[PDB]
Write a protein that binds this DNA or RNA. Structure first.
Lengths: 257, 187, 145, 122
RNA sequence: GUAACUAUGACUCUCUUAAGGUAGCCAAAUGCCUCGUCAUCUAAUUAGUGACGCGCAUGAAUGGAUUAACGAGAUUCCCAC
RNA sequence: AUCUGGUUGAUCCUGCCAGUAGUCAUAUGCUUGUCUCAAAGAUUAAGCCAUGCAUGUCUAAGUAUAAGCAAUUUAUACAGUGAAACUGCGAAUGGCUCAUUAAAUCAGUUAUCGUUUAUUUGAUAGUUCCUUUACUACAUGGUAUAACUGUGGUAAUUCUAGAGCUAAUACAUGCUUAAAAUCUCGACCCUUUGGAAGAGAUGUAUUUAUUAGAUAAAAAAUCAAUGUCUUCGGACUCUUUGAUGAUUCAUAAUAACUUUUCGAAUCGCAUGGCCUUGUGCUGGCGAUGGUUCAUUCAAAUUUCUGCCCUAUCAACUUUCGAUGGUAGGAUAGUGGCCUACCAUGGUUUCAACGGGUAACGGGGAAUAAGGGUUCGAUUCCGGAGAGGGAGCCUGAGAAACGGCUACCA
RNA sequence: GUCGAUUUUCCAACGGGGCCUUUCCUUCUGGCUAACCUUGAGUCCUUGUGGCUCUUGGCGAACCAGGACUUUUACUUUGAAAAAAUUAGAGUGUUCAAAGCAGGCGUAUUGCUCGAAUAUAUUAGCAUGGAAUAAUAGAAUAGGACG
RNA sequence: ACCCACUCGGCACCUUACGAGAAAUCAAAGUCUUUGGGUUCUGGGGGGAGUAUGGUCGCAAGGCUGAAACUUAAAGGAAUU
RNA sequence: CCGCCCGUCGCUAGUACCGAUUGAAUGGCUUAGUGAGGCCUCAGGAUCUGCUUAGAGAAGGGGGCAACUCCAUCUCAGAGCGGAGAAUUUGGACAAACUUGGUCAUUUAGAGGAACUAAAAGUCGUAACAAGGUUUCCGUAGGUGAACCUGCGGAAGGAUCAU
C-alpha cells in the first residue's frame, strides 16, 4: 500500500452510522483514538447526523473548537475523534450527557443521562499484567490503563472508572447469572444474562446468553460485555433494553400507534 | 539490495515463479560488514523506525561472563581459534556469535585471588571472608591450565554485527571438553 | 534419529540460556528443559528423559504451537527430522453434485521424541515457519501396526 | 466516482411479437382505458409478473412460517390499499389470479372518468 | 498434323531395320548456342548454390538416382589469422 | 418452464441454417418536443505529448529589526498585523490505469508465544555533578548559517559563488535531590552463643551471562551449617509468587557492559498565596517535547481450501539453493532469505512442469422453470505500475517516480 | 369456556426426556450438595402420613475445575463471524415511477415522535446435535481385556 | 451304449407377441420426460479431411494420434405413391 | 432413364502445404566476456578548524619602567585531538546495460514443386444408381489418359432369410 490510508470512501464506511449513499463520495475517516475504526462513532456523525445540532461538517468545527463537547470529561476538539461504546459525550450547553450505547437493532442510539450517572464508564477488562517495577496494571477496551487494580480483577471482567480522576471504584466478575451487553455479532445491541460459557482452548470461548423471554443465543466472550447483575444494571439501558423483537411483533408495536 | 524475499526462489514443486513487485524495501537485507580483532571501531545503521543497529568493525575488549562464579570481567580478546560455521572466519580473526576465542584471563586471576582463594594456575575482614568461603569450590583441571597459559577459552554470545558488542560466556565443563577435542583435532 | 550421536555437528549441541553449573554437586549433573505443548498433547517420556537437542521440538525447543491442528498419513520420512504427510480430502463440485480426491502433501518436522515409518497417522500443529516449506510440528503419532 | 445510482426498467416486450390474439386483446384493453402505447400494458404485465413470482415464492414453502406470514400480509395489505383486491379476497391465492385489467381500473384517468365530470376517458 | 481453349493429353498415320529413352537425373567432370533463364550469395560474381529442361550429344551393372563415414582429390562461401 | 420457416412428388425422422426475445454490451444509420437521472479514450497504442494546473502548510501557544503596513493613547529588550527564510509536519494519502501476474495476486478463514508501528488515546521518569568547605543553572557555545545587505558569472535551469550580519523546540554540549533500605570493601578485640568506624555503588536504556518466575497428597529416625527464644528439660510455630491450551512470558534479582539513549537550558494566558519588602520564596490553566509499556491508525510475513484452455506439454528441480539438517550472517523480525559445512532430497496421471490467455482477483453483471452459460478494464475492497529494467537517499512509513542516480528507447 | 378480538375438557395428530426389560453417558478429589434413602426435640393440629424452626450416619446429577484417557473420517442439523454497494424484501403519496432513506403529528411561540428492518450468500475453516448410508482397524505364535 | 418321456444348469438359436422405436424392426434395440444398478469408449450439419503439420513406431509400404483457413442449405436415415 | 451422376484435361480465382536461401524480424530465457551507477567497506586528507597561555624579537606594541597600564599585542617550531570534512580511490554484494553465441515461441519473404476447393459445365469418356449391362463395397498389392481395371482375403449395406 506504501504507508497507512487517510481517506474513507462513503460506501466503505461502517453501516451503523447510516450515512446516506449519495451526497459526497467520502465518509469521516475517524482519527486514531480509544476505540477501533469499525466499532467507533466520530463526533462529526454524532453532532451533525444523530443530534442534527449542526447542518454541515464545517458547523461541527465551530461547535468543537468552542470547547463544549467533552467525550470522557476532557475537551476533545478533533472532528473525527473515535468516540465509541460507554463514552459520555457531554454538551455543557443544554446540559446533555449522552452515553453512547447500542440501539437494539445494532446502531449507536442517542441516550440522554443525568450527571449523577455521567461520572463513570464501565471499562471491560482486557489484558492484565505486571508492568516495569513489578507494578500490576489493567487495560480496558477504551485503551485506558489503570495501575494498582484490585488483585481479583482478571480478564473479561468490567471495572467502573471514576472518569473525573480516572481510577477504578467497583468491578463485576464474569460467570453465570450476570447481566451482559453484546458488543457486535448480529446480536449487537442485545442485553441478556449468562447461562454458561465454554473452554475452547485457543478456539474462541463461546458463551450461551438467555434474555428476559427465555430466548437463548450464543456469542463470543469478546463481543460479550459484562454490564451488571440481574435487576440493577450499573448504567441506564436504552428504551427497548436489548430484547430483539421478531419482524411480526415489532411491526405490531409500530402499527398499534 | 540483498532482498530476503521468498517470492523469487523457485517454488517447492520446482516451478520458477514469474517476478512481480519490483523489489520492495521491507524485504531489505544488508552487507555483512565483518568485525576483526583490535583497534575498536563502530558504525551505526538506521533500521526500520530510526531504531539504530551498531555494526562493530575491529571491536576490542568484550564483556565476558564466568557463569559458574556468577561474575563478568571486561577483557582483551587475543584471537579466534575455532568456529563451527567456516574455517576462514578463524584465519581472518573475525568476531561473530558462537566463535571460540582466547581472552587475556588476567582480570579473572586478579578477581579469583582477591575475592575467593589463592593464586590459581598453581586485613582481618578479608581473612574472615576467605575463611568463610572455606574452600567454596575448586576448578576441575581444565580451566586451571588456561590462567597460567595466560589466555583462557571463551565463546561469543552477543551478535557483534548488530549489537556492536562482543560479550559473553567463558567456556567450562563438557562444553570445554568438546571444543578442546574439536580444536586439537584440526590444530 | 541420525542416530546414536548428540555430539555430531561442528557447534556445541546446547539448550539455550540453560546452564549446567559445574561447581554445584548434583548426582545426575544433566538438566533438560521441557514445556507443556498444550491443548491436551501428553509430552512423551522419550523427550523428558532423552539426550537430544532439536530447537524446533514443540516440547524441548523455542517454538510455541499456535494456529490449527491438522492430521494425515505419512508418505515420506527420507530427510533428517522432517517427514511428508498426505492430507486426502474430497472437493465437492456444485454442478455435478459430486466430489473428487486431492492430495495436498504437507512437509512436517518430527522431533526425536517420536518414531514414524511410512503409513502412520500423525496429528501435527501449526508453529512459526521452520523452513521454506515446513510450517507444522508433529505432536501426536498413531502407528496402526 | 461516488456510488452507482440504481436504475431498473419497469416494462417487458412480449416473447413472440406478432400474434393476432395478443394484438386483439392488448388494443381492446388499451382502447377501453385510453392508453398511449402497448408499453403501458407491458409495464402493468411486468408489475403483475413481479407480484405473481413474489406470491409463488411465499406459497411453495411452509404455512404459518414468519417469512410467508409477514411478506404475504405486506403484499395483500399493499394491494387491498391500492384496490386491486377488495375486502373479501385476502387469502394469497386470489392475488395469483389478479388480471392486469384490475390494475388498469385504478389509474387516475380511469378514476377521473368513473367519478364523473370527465366525459369519455380520453 | 486436327481438337476445349488460346497454346493441344481426345482423335488420326508411319513406324530405321527391333524397340522408340521408362523410373530417374542435369547447363552435371556429360549443354554447341552459353556468360541459358529464374532465385540466391556480392556494392558489383563468365564463379558458387538451389530450381527450370524439345537434353547440339543424360539414363539404368558400358549401371541410374541417393548416400553416413573417409580423402596430401576438384571447387564455392564464412569466421579466426 | 412456449417455439415457427427450410432437405421430399408427399411423409415421419436425424440434423443443422434462418427466424424470435433480452443484453448497467459495443459501434453505426435515420429521426428527436418535455421531466428526473446519468455512463463516457477500457479493447487498437502501459504508444507520444505542446501548454496551464493537480502539495503545501501558522496558532495566544518554535525563530522576527521585512530597511512591509502599522501609529496610538500597554511598549525602551521584545509584545499588533503581517512577507521571505530557518524549524516542525506533510508531500507514502488521494486520483489514474490494468501492462505484468494462473497457487501468483485474490476471496473467506487463521497465526504472530515470529515482528516494526509516526500520529492518536491512556499510563509512565526525586537516582545524571563523582569524592563532599564558597564546580554556568537567576540559564552554556558558534566549535553556524539562513532569510536579509552587497560584489558577480552563463545564452540558458526550482544554477549559486565570494563577502558582511543575525536567531531558534535548528545544531552542539551541560548541572541543579529528599528519604530509606540493600549490597559490597574495612577504622575495631578474643580465643568467643565470636561482632564493626567509615567509603562507594544500586534511575532508565543497550548487550551478555546467572537466578527467581512455585505446587496432586500425611507421618519419620539421623549427622552437620546451630542463629535467636532457652519460659536454661529443650521450643523456633506462622516461612512467600501474576497470566495462557502452551512459553526461556510479563516481571523481578546477581555480575557487569556501552564510541552511556533518555531525564525538559522550550513557548502562551492569568499574574494569585505567606512577609523575612528580597524588588525574594511559593503557585493555576495550557502548548510543544520527551523515555518505556499499553492503545489506535497501520504494516510485514502467515494457516487452510478454492482459479480459465491445452498431453500435437510426462517427467520437473539440484555447478549458479533445488528439499532438509547444524551453525553463522542478515532482517523490524520468521525463514535457504544469504553464507559455510553436511545429507540427497522435494513435485507429479488426484495432471507436476512446459505453452496460451484479445487473464489483474473479488464484491458483482446479462439471461432467467430448475440446473446453468457468458462476462466483470470500469463508482467498493485488495494487488500491481507510473516509457523499460536496476539502484538509493530522506523519513514512522517508499525500493516513491508531479524524489534522486545510472544504463536502454 | 366470552366480551367482531380469546381456552377447557369428552378428545386426537405430530415431534421428545427419564425408566428397565442382560443394556450403560469411562468414571474420580475437592467444592455445593437444594436435598430424605433417614429423624434432633417433634408437632404448631375438624377424628388426619394435612405441615416444617430445622438438621447424626449417605445421597450427588442443582453443581463445576481439576484430574485423564478417548480406533478415525465423510454425511446431515443448528449456531457462531460472514464489509458496504448490488440482489430479494419491510416501511414511507420523491405529484406518479426509476429513485431517495426520508419523513410523520401536535400549541404547529419553548415542540414531540416512528424509522434507516429482515433474508440468501448452498465452497473451506470454527463450534454444535444425530449416528440411517459408506469405508478403517480392534483378540489369532494372544505382546487380548478387567482387578 | 443307442433310443423314448419328464426334469433341470449352461450353449449356439429359431417361431409367434401387450413395451420401445423415425421407421425397417427386437430375447433386447424392453424395465426411458413416471427420465439414475456399476462402468469404459465414441459423436455434435455437409464438405475440406483422416488432409496438412508435429511427435511416435516401422526395413519399406504405412500405422497411431490429428487440425485449421475457406466453402455450403442442406447432406443423410426409414418408409409411401 | 431423353432421369441421375463420377474423374482426367482446359479456362478462371481463391486457400493451404514442401522449398536452396548459413532466410529475416520481434519476444522471452540463457552461455562466456566487458560492466555505468548508487549502497557497505579498506584508505585518503583540498580546505575550515578550538583550546593551543605554546618561547618568540614587538620598547601608547593598556589612561607610558611595570612576567606593557599582555592586543583577535609581533609570529608560528610545535603540537595533541575536539574535530568537521570534499574529490580521490581499495575491495564487496545489488545490478542495469553492452557484446557474443545458444534454445524456444510468435510473425513472415521466397524462384520453383506438388496440391485442394469453388465457379459456367467447355473437352474426353460413362465409373456409380436397375442384375447400371462386369452386383456393390471394405482392407491391401500392382497397373492405367481419366473415370477405373485386376489379384487376394473379407462383408451383404445382394439380385438368395429355401432342399
Amino acid at each position: 500500500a506504501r504507508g497507512p490510508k487517510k481517506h474513507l470512501k462513503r460506501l466503505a464506511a461502517p453501516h451503523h452510522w447510516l450515512l446516506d449513499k449519495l451526497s459526497g463520495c467520502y465518509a469521516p475517516r475517524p482519527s486514531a483514538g480509544p476505540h477501533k475504526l469499525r466499532e467507533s462513532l466520530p463526533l462529526i456523525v454524532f453532532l451533525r447526523n444523530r443530534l442534527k445540532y449542526a447542518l454541515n461538517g464545517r458547523e461541527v468545527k465551530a461547535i468543537l473548537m468552542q470547547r463544549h463537547v467533552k467525550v470522557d470529561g476532557k475537551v476533545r476538539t478533533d472532528t473525527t475523534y473515535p468516540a465509541g461504546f460507554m463514552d459520555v459525550i457531554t454538551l455543557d450547553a443544554t446540559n446533555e450527557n449522552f452515553r453512547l450505547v447500542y440501539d437494539v437493532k445494532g446502531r449507536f442510539a442517542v441516550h440522554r443521562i443525568t450527571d449523577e450517572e455521567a461520572s463513570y464508564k464501565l471499562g471491560k477488562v482486557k489484558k492484565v499484567q505486571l508492568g516495569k517495577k513489578g507494578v500490576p496494571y489493567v487495560v480496558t477496551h477504551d485503551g485506558r490503563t489503570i495501575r494498582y487494580p484490585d488483585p481479583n480483577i482478571k480478564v473479561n471482567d468490567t471495572v467502573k472508572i471514576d472518569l473525573a480522576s480516572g481510577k477504578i471504584t467497583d468491578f463485576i466478575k464474569f460467570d453465570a447469572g450476570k447481566l451482559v451487553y453484546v458488543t457486535g455479532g448480529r446480536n449487537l445491541g442485545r442485553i441478556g444474562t449468562i447461562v454458561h460459557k465454554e473452554r475452547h482452548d485457543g478456539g474462541f470461548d463461546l458463551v450461551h446468553i438467555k434474555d428476559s423471554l427465555d430466548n437463548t443465543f450464543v456469542t463470543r466472550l469478546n463481543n460479550v460485555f459484562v454490564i451488571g447483575e440481574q435487576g440493577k444494571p450499573y448504567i441506564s439501558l436504552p428504551k427497548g433494553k436489548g430484547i430483539k423483537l421478531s419482524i411480526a411483533e415489532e411491526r405490531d408495536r409500530r402499527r398499534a400507534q | 539490495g540483498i532482498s530476503r524475499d521468498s517470492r523469487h526462489k523457485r517454488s517447492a514443486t520446482g516451478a520458477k515463479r514469474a517476478q512481480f513487485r519490483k523489489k520492495r524495501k521491507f524485504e531489505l537485507g544488508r552487507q555483512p560488514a565483518n568485525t576483526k580483532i583490535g583497534a575498536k571501531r563502530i558504525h551505526s545503521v538506521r533500521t526500520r523506525g530510526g531504531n539504530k543497529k551498531y555494526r562493530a568493525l575491529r571491536i576490542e575488549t568484550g564483556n565476558f561472563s564466568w557463569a559458574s562464579e556468577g561474575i563478568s570481567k571486561k577483557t582483551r580478546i587475543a584471537g579466534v581459534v575455532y568456529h563451527p560455521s567456516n574455517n576462514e572466519l578463524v584465519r581472518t580473526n573475525t568476531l561473530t556469535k558462537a566463535a571460540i576465542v582466547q581472552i587475556d584471563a588476567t582480570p579473572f586471576r586478579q578477581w579469583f585471588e582477591a575475592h575467593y582463594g589463592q593464586t590459581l594456575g598453581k586485613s582481618k575482614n578479608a581473612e574472615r571472608k576467605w575463611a568463610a568461603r572455606a574452600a567454596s569450590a575448586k576448578i576441575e583441571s581444565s580451566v586451571e591450565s588456561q590462567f597460567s597459559a595466560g589466555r583462557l577459552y571463551a565463546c561469543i554470545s552477543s551478535r557483534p554485527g548488530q549489537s556492536g558488542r562482543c560479550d559473553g560466556y567463558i567456556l567450562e565443563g563438557e562444553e570445554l571438553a568438546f571444543y578442546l577435542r574439536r580444536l586439537t583435532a584440526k590444530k | 534419529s541420525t542416530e546414536l550421536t548428540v555430539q555430531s555437528e561442528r557447534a556445541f549441541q546446547k539448550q539455550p540460556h540453560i546452564f549446567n553449573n559445574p561447581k554445584v554437586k548434583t548426582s545426575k549433573r544433566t538438566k533438560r528443559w521441557y514445556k507443556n505443548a498444550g491443548l491436551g498433547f501428553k509430552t512423551p517420556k522419550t523427550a523428558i528423559e532423552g539426550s537430544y537437542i532439536d530447537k524446533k521440538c514443540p516440547f524441548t525447543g523455542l517454538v510455541s504451537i499456535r494456529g490449527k491442528i491438522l492430521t494425515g498419513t505419512v508418505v515420506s520420512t527420507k530427510m533428517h527430522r522432517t517427514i511428508v504427510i498426505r492430507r486426502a480430502y474430497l472437493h465437492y463440485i456444485p454442478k455435478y453434485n459430486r466430489y473428487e480426491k486431492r492430495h495436498k502433501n504437507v512437509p512436517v518436522h518430527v522431533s526425536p521424541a517420536f518414531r514414524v515409518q511410512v503409513g502412520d497417522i500423525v496429528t501435527v500443529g501449526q508453529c512459526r515457519p521452520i523452513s521454506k516449506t515446513v510450517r507444522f510440528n508433529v505432536v501426536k503419532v498413531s502407528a496402526a501396526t | 466516482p461516488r456510488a452507482p445510482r440504481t436504475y431498473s426498467k419497469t416494462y417487458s416486450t412480449p416473447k413472440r411479437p406478432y400474434e393476432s390474439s395478443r394484438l386483439d386483446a392488448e388494443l381492446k384493453l388499451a382502447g377501453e382505458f385510453g392508453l398511449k402505447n402497448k408499453r403501458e400494458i407491458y409495464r402493468i404485465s411486468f408489475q403483475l409478473s413481479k407480484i405473481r413470482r413474489a406470491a409463488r415464492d411465499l406459497l411453495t414453502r411452509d404455512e404459518k412460517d414468519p417469512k410467508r406470514l409477514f411478506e404475504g400480509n405486506a403484499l395483500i395489505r399493499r394491494l387491498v390499499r391500492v384496490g386491486v383486491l377488495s375486502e373479501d379476497k385476502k387469502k394469497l391465492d386470489y392475488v395469483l389470479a389478479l388480471k392486469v385489467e384490475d390494475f388498469l381500473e385504478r389509474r387516475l384517468q380511469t378514476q377521473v372518468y368513473k367519478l364523473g365530470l370527465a366525459k369519455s376517458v380520453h
